[PDB]
Design a protein around this ligand. Structure first.
Ligand SMILES: Cc1cc2nc3c(=O)[nH]c(=O)nc-3n(C[C@H](O)[C@H](O)[C@H](O)CO)c2cc1C
Length: 170
């Protein structure tokens, strides 16, 4: 039944939006970087149903969060762009031969791409957002690499240990 999958997707974008209110800065200096575990639900959906569906969960969840927090379109756009890359790369790698090996490799390749991708965009957004010299991005660089690494690392480890316990329940 597709309605069982629509239910699953609709449920998991609702939890992805709720859990986002738990955001907090891991680094008090780079306080604009806030961690939230909202992509663990999307990565589960990506793994159990397809990369495109998991990315769709990230977009629905961030749209809903922006309407409730309209004060930050820049900081939600970057979360949306990175979350869909991370959960997209991981699911595409993994679905070519569903196993833990390509689940593990899917999340590592996705984590390192999203982090480099973050560094490239965080290189272009930080000076504009703070109306500051490129100096400041280089000052933020060690926090940016460390943060998007811990964020998508913990999201990978958590997802890895939970998402087949989720396939059993279905
Ligand atoms: C300037 C700016 C840069 C951000 N950079 C990253 C990033 O590089 N990697 C990431 O995972 N999240 C990043 N975020 C995600 C951030 O936690 C999210 O957008 C929050 O809603 C910002 O308050 C960034 C946010 C902002 C505002």
């Amino acid at each position: 039944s597709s309605i069982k999958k629509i239910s699953f997707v609709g449920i998991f974008s609702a939890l992805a939006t709720l859990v986002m209110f738990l955001e907090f800065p891991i680094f008090p200096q780079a306080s604009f970087l806030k961690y939230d575990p909202s992509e663990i639900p999307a990565l589960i959906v990506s793994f159990l149903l397809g990369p495109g569906v998991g990315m769709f969960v990230v977009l629905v969840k961030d749209i809903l969060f922006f309407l409730m927090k309209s004060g930050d379109p820049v900081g939600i756009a970057m979360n949306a762009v990175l979350g869909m890359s991370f959960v997209g790369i991981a699911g595409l790698i993994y679905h070519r031969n569903k196993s833990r090996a390509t689940a593990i490799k899917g999340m590592i390749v996705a984590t390192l791409f999203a982090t480099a991708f973050a560094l490239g965009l965080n290189a272009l957004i930080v000076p504009l957002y703070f109306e500051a010299p490129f100096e400041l991005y280089l000052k933020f660089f060690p926090f940016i690499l460390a943060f998007n690494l811990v964020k998508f690392g913990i999201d990978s480890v958590v997802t890895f240990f939970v998402y087949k316990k989720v396939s059993s329940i279905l």
